[PDB]
Amino acid sequence: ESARREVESQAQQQLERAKHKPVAFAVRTNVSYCGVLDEECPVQGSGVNFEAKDFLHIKEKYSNDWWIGRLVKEGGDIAFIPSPQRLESIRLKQEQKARRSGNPSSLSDIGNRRSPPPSLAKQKQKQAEHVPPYDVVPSMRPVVLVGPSLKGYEVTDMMQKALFDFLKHRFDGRISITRVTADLSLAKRSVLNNPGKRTIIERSSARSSIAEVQSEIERIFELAKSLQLVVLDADTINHPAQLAKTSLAPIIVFVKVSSPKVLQRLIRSRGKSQMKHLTVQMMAYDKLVQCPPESFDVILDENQLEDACEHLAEYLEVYWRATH
């Protein structure tokens, strides 16, 4: 047919003309689906074989069924990813190849109970959580440093100020440093339509701190849309799970001492002031190191300054070359 070849050529020239244009926004996925094996894509052979835990970048507009995207992989070419409704449709198609998907079991029961599919067999039900296949995340991954122990204390404070000064100095002109004095662990998306929309409601949630924390969320988004790498100097988060289910999806950097024996004397070296909070300062270390390392993105398990320095320099270097 001539129409399919014509739309193929049109998509090809649109991709060629859109190779050098700014990226619009990014998406987050939670299902391992391949966009190259689907025959409904406008262009065959130019799909994306992306697994879960992956980020995609959208630049231009195609239709309500497919979009033009790019991978965070280095050297990844321009491909097409399904739309969220297209992903819902393909998820529905995934469970229809099986013998049964609704209530009527096939345990030697054919022709007795036809059981036409009710509203229970469609995606209308199972709406208690209903996690969307796509999540909105900042275009550039934010970087968060976790205290080897409770933030706001001397030892940890110098531990992250060293990295902050290094990223500022070596990488000036392309990285912006922002400090979040307020909390950031109260980032929720499926609680209510608008809890405390106005400050004049005099509600319990209106006069609480959740409004400012909610306002903190999107400024990270606008800083990410500027292509400039941004870090988060949050003084409240001390565990990856505290900021893992939110829509930020940040890069978490682990600065840790190899042994608590070294940490105790390192705390001792500060003075008598830290002796009072030393007791509670051990648990912030041991609970955090008990966390599995797969949650953490990068690990700094060494004690020399320059080796860890170049380690993180090269990590953000590979992140830089990933999206350029």
Binding site: V155, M158, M159, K161, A162, D165, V257, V262, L266, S269, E302, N303, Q304, L305
Partner: peptide, 15 residues
């Protein structure tokens, strides 16, 4: 190693 780390980090506390 960690004392060197804290020394360099604390030295730049001046501003």
């Amino acid at each position: 190693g960690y004392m060197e780390w804290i020394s360099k980090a604390e030295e730049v506390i001046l501003a």
